[PDB]
């Protein structure tokens, strides 16, 4: 039945509710566009034949083709929009710059969309008030104390604390730092909040 | 991640909802009322099975192209069985979206609408207490025996109950203040 | 007016925004005033020596305020991104003298989001469709806020002759009165003017 | 709303401390505090009281309702009544946890008090269960809640309102 | 939690005593057949009497079938028995006029009424007794019930008819010897210092006696006051035949 | 008739988609009309004792 090639797109995303992003399927998308083109050509041919021959009993088959086209459009558009939702989540989890391992799954146009979104969102935050606004993507949990103790999980480069002062994030080194500087590195998975 | 919600219980499906897209794929039995060419032809009177989306598309209120009938599980023989004790029946071996699909058959203006509505409402009220007690009270155990028979709509309520339980137990045992990584824990 | 009351008003707006199923009306005055308070206090701590006890107390106070402001603004932004055609069209329709649901910066962000999303879909799939199917209407595709949601509330001023409609048969309609300091569970659609007017609080 | 946020609200309640140092009056956005003198009591919000206690800078004094004689009478009255009774503090559960974890050294008969407060939580939660079930069986449209606290609402509330949304949709469907 | 959201007052019990006039309307055939079916019932009570001994289980079992067949009030039901109760009330008022035509006919229908009342009082569960004695004017207050066991000894020693079990299941309360008039003047049972240790059936006898007195006054009123109502009397010969 | 017209409209659209005796009070000379009931009109019935 005419729906089946489109359902591959839908059924993939439905199987994974965790928000994680699968690889962009190209051949299924092309196949749906080709299928719709074929159905359109057949319907146009029968329409002009019915109109020129003066023959009425073709009308039910014409309606039959018409609704099939709209079903195919709904399946493909519904598939694209969900990927946009999964992409938007990566800005608010993780951070401003994505890891290359994860960018491998996005299409070119998806990268265009993501960069536009970052530019606009950064413009909004900068305008909130005072000078240079407020980064509302932080303070995700209600605050209990000024300072926290953190343990490094990965060998990482130099980390700047204030002006020229910096610390070296070698694995299993341990530091006592103010909470507001560590918060994003803990979220990305570089550091561990002990005790 | 703002998943688009299902519309099924209302007067329309949500256009972009994945669940409504899957649910509307289900097959429905019909009778053909006018002969159809180039499908060779299908003669008038032929009995068929075809998807719900297509049946709604072709059903003009004149009933000029086709006429529709209820599947067995929504007819009187089965409604009588649900009425005995609704806790025992397996609404996952029935169609996985029982209430959602059942609510959309009222569109076709059958004389049995008044009975279908009462069937669905009474089934829901009958099943409610078990979902409440079992979701709220099962802590750090194998739930697979409990969630086995639940419809897709009912499963959402089970998950919400479990989530609410877990949060309080974290808070009481002092684990709630720690900062941690989100869904990127995959990597 | 006095700073204590300003903070109390912010913490009231926070909870109304959490539980209401729509985008409630804007509060530009509160945001501007709270922001300048934080700027002022920062400079005052910057001018004093950093070793003292009372300085640490002041810093803790500022963290508690900044968290509420951030949380409130994040929630409003979720609702803008989720219902973009509807909030845009409603603002376009609004008559003079009635308050807007959007601050100017929020409206700017919404317009950018609308344009960006349409462009992506058009370039990826719709230009390849047959000529009769290249247009789609996002105003129809995107769902609407569900005002029949149930909510808990607490009343701050007495109210009288509120109509409750079970089902939708007029034979079951009846009226109730909301006494000072009581708490109730009821559908959001019936109480919506009371929340906007400030007569009740959602909890 | 999470338990963390409900606790964030509970931390605004005022408590009495005895400092072991001296400091002038201090002006905050939320109000004026002090002056602080050694060996003499002063009122401060709970978030400040806990912090000074951890850094060994003061002594906590139990609130006047934290008393075995008072709590026994309250428990018995709660068990007897057919509805929710009014409570000694709107944030009784949160205050109990915070004070008894940090300040057991200053609060006598702490392990008696834990059991008395646990009993009240167990009774009130049971009443809420019965009310929810009765709401759905009778297909009711409105209810009244005059003595429930915000933690008790927040624990079980999300489930109930989620179920009522669906039920209201099923019963209306024959009349678009 | 606390939630928010007519004919009951007419007959809270199946028992009724005709104090209030039903101030409403009736059809011709309605009042006709309401009365005539009860005429059949009056004859039927004594037909059952000639069939076998009064008030036995055979009587009880057949009698309730008559009521179910004849749609008048019952052992009290929780559904709409108020309709049979008002039918019984209305038809009772209608029955006052037919057999007032002769005192022998008056006494005849009174006697089957006493038999019917005795049957109904025999059927009564405990809750009926408890609520009707308080909801009616038939109060008859009890005094110092703890002494009943001293009378469990004394009555049992002092009475051929009564027994220790009857003290409890024909539950004993204290009222005067005169409310047990036939028992004092026959000297049949333990009564002391002018007081009787009384079960419900004595108060039933008093109920029947005051019912007879009030009904006799009503029958006198029926004989006297009725002529303004007598614009139609066509049924009276068929009723007295 | 009308049903066939609507059927033909659907067909055409679907196919083309792929391509004075007494006077009082000096009534005369004045124009005679109402506001169609659109003014502040009100109607109320009176009676005594009812």
């Amino acid at each position: 039945m005419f729906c089946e090639k489109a359902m591959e797109l839908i059924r993939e995303l439905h199987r994974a509710p965790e928000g994680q992003l699968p690889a962009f399927n190209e051949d299924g998308l092309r196949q749906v566009l080709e299928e719709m083109k074929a159905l359109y050509e057949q319907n146009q041919s029968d329409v002009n034949e019915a109109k020129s021959g003066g023959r009425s009993d073709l009308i039910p088959t014409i309606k039959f083709r018409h609704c099939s086209l709209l079903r195919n459009r709904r399946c493909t558009v519904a598939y694209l929009y969900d990927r946009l939702l999964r992409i938007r989540a990566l800005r608010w989890e993780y951070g401003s710059v994505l890891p290359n391992a994860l960018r491998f799954h996005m299409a070119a146009e998806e990268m265009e969309w993501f960069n536009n979104y970052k530019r606009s969102l950064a413009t909004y935050m900068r305008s909130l008030g005072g000078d240079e606004g407020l980064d509302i993507t932080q303070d995700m949990k209600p605050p209990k104390s000024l300072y926290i103790e953190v343990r490094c999980l990965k060998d990482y480069g130099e980390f700047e604390v204030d002006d020229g002062t910096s610390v070296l994030l070698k694995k299993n080194s341990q530091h006592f730092l103010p909470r507001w500087k560590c918060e994003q590195l803990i979220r990305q998975g570089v550091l561990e909040h002990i005790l | 991640y703002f998943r688009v919600e299902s519309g099924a219980l209302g007067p329309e499906e949500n256009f972009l909802s994945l669940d409504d897209i899957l649910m509307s794929h289900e097959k429905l039995p019909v009778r053909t009322e006018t002969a159809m060419p180039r499908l060779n032809a299908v003669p008038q009177g032929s009995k068929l099975e075809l998807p719900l989306w297509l049946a709604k598309g072709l059903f003009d209120n004149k009933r000029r192209i086709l006429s529709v009938e209820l599947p067995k599980i929504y007819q009187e023989g089965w409604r009588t069985v649900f009425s005995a004790d609704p806790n025992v029946v397996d609404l996952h071996k029935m169609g996985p979206h029982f209430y959602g699909f059942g609510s959309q058959l009222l569109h076709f203006d059958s004389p049995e609408n008044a009975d279908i509505s009462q069937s669905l409402l009474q089934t829901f009220i009958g099943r409610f207490r078990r979902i409440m007690d079992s979701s709220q009270n099962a802590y750090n155990e194998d739930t697979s025996a409990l969630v086995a028979r639940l419809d897709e709509m009912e499963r959402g309520l089970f998950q919400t109950g479990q989530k609410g339980l877990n949060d309080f137990q974290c808070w009481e045992k002092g684990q709630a203040s720690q900062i941690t990584a989100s869904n990127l824990v995959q990597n | 007016l006095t700073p204590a009351e300003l903070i109390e008003r912010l913490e009231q707006a926070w909870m109304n925004e959490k539980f209401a199923p729509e985008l409630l009306e804007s509060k530009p005055e509160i945001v501007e005033c709270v922001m300048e308070q934080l700027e002022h206090m920062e400079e005052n701590l910057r001018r004093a020596k950093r070793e003292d006890l009372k300085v640490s107390i002041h810093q803790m106070e500022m963290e508690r305020i900044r968290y509420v402001l951030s949380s409130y603004l994040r929630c409003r932004l979720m609702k803008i991104e989720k219902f973009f055609p509807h909030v845009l069209e409603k603002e376009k329709t609004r008559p003079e003298g009635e308050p807007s649901s959007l601050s100017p910066e929020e409206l700017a962000f919404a317009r950018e989001f609308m344009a960006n999303t349409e462009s992506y879909l058009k370039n990826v799939a719709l230009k390849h469709m047959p000529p009769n199917l290249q247009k789609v209407d996002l105003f129809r595709a995107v769902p609407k806020p569900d005002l029949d949601s149930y909510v808990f509330l607490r009343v701050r001023e007495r109210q009288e002759n509120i109509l409750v409609e079970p089902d939708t048969d007029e034979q079951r309609d009846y009226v109730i009165d909301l006494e000072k300091g009581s708490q109730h569970l009821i559908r959001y659609k019936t109480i919506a003017p009371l929340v906007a007017s400030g007569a009740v609080q959602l909890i | 709303m999470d338990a963390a946020e409900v606790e964030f609200l509970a931390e605004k309640e005022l408590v009495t401390i005895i400092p072991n140092f001296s400091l002038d009056k201090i002006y905050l956005i939320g109000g004026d505090l002090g002056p602080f003198n050694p060996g003499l009591p002063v009122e401060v919000p709970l978030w400040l009281a806990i912090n000074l206690k951890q850094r060994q800078k003061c002594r906590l004094l139990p609130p006047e309702w934290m008393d075995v004689e008072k709590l026994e009478k309250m428990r018995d009255h709660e068990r007897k009544e057919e509805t929710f009774t009014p409570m000694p503090s709107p944030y009784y559960m949160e205050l109990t946890k915070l004070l008894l974890n940090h300040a057991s050294d200053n609060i006598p008969k702490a392990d008696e008090i834990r059991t008395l407060v646990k009993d009240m939580w167990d009774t009130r939660i049971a009443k809420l269960r019965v009310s929810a079930d009765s709401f759905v069986r009778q297909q009711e449209a409105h209810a009244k809640l005059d003595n429930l606290t915000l933690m008790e609402i927040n624990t079980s509330g999300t489930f109930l309102t989620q179920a009522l949304n669906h039920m209201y949709k099923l019963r209306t469907n024959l009349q678009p | 939690m606390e939630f928010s959201g007519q004919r009951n007052a007419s007959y809270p019990h199946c028992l009724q005593f005709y104090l209030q006039p039903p101030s409403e309307n009736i059809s011709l055939i309605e009042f006709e057949n309401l009365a005539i079916d009860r005429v059949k019932l009056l004859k039927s009570v004594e037909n059952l009497g000639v069939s076998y001994v009064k008030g036995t289980e055979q009587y009880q079992s057949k009698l309730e079938s008559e009521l179910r067949k004849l749609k008048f009030s019952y052992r009290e039901n929780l559904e709409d028995e108020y309709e049979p109760r008002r039918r019984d009330h209305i038809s009772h008022f209608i029955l006052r006029l037919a057999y007032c035509q002769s005192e022998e006919l008056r006494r005849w229908f009174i006697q089957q009424e006493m038999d019917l009342l005795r049957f109904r009082f025999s059927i009564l569960p405990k809750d009926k007794i408890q609520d009707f004695l308080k909801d009616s004017q038939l109060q008859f207050e009890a005094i110092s019930d703890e002494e009943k066991t001293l009378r469990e000894q004394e009555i049992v020693a002092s009475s051929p008819s009564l027994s220790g079990l009857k003290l409890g299941f024909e539950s004993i309360y204290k009222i005067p010897f005169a409310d047990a008039l036939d028992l004092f003047r026959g000297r049949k049972v333990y009564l002391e210092d002018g007081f009787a240790y009384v079960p419900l059936k004595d108060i039933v006898a008093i109920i029947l006696n005051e019912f007879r007195a009030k009904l006799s006054k009503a029958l006198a009123l029926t004989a006297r006051s009725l002529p303004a109502v007598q614009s139609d009397e066509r049924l009276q010969p068929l009723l007295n035949h | 008739i009308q049903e066939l017209i609507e059927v033909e409209e659907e067909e055409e659209i679907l196919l083309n988609s792929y391509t004075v005796v007494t006077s009082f009070g000096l009534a005369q000379g004045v124009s005679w009309s109402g506001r169609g009931g659109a003014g502040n009109i009100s109607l109320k019935v009176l009676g005594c004792p009812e």
Side-chain angles (χ1 to χ4, degrees), chain E residues 43-56:
Chain E
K43 295 175 179 181
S44 301
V45 169
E46 306 308 332
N47 303 136
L48 195 56
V50 308
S51 303
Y52 37 63
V53 174
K54 293 295 198 170
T56 67

Side-chain angles (χ1 to χ4, degrees), chain D residues 83 131 140 144-145, chain E residues 1-5:
Chain D
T83 189
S131 300
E140 192 49 77
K144 185 177 170 188
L145 282 160
Chain E
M1 296 205 210
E2 284 143 38
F3 305 111
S4 182

Side-chain angles (χ1 to χ4, degrees), chain E residues 193-208:
Chain E
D193 298 350
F195 277 90
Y197 301 99
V198 162
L200 177 62
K201 55 196 177 192
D202 294 341
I203 295 303
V204 176
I206 288 157
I207 285 161
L208 295 157

Side-chain angles (χ1 to χ4, degrees), chain A residues 16-22 82-83 85-87 89-90, chain B residues 1 183 186:
Chain A
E18 297 287 352
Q20 63 202 7
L21 182 60
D82 189 69
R83 288 179 60 85
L85 299 178
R86 295 183 197 237
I87 285 162
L90 295 173
Chain B
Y1 174 44
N183 81 348
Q186 75 184 355

Side-chain angles (χ1 to χ4, degrees), chain C residues 133-188:
Chain C
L133 300 175
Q134 301 197 347
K135 301 296 187 179
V136 69
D137 187 2
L138 295 185
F139 192 87
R140 288 276 297 284
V142 176
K144 290 182 181 178
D146 189 26
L147 271 69
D148 280 313
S149 303
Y150 274 70
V151 296
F152 292 90
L153 67 92
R154 176 159 60 215
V155 307
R156 305 194 311 122
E157 297 182 39
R158 189 171 188 273
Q159 290 290 275
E160 192 164 77
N161 294 318
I162 298 297
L163 184 144
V164 186
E165 172 166 7
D167 204 324
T168 187
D169 295 351
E170 181 169 41
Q171 292 77 10
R172 293 192 178 206
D173 290 351
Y174 65 115
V175 301
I176 62 170
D177 302 322
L178 302 177
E179 298 301 334
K180 182 67 149 62
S182 58
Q183 307 187 145
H184 309 264
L185 172 56
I186 197 169
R187 275 196 297 125
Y188 176 81

Side-chain angles (χ1 to χ4, degrees), chain A residues 4 46 61 74 82 93 193, chain B residues 1 13 25 37-38 178 182:
Chain A
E4 286 299 306
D46 291 1
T61 301
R74 178 176 174 196
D82 189 69
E93 310 307 336
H193 185 336
Chain B
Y1 174 44
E13 295 162 44
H25 189 255
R38 293 167 60 69
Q178 189 176 25
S182 62

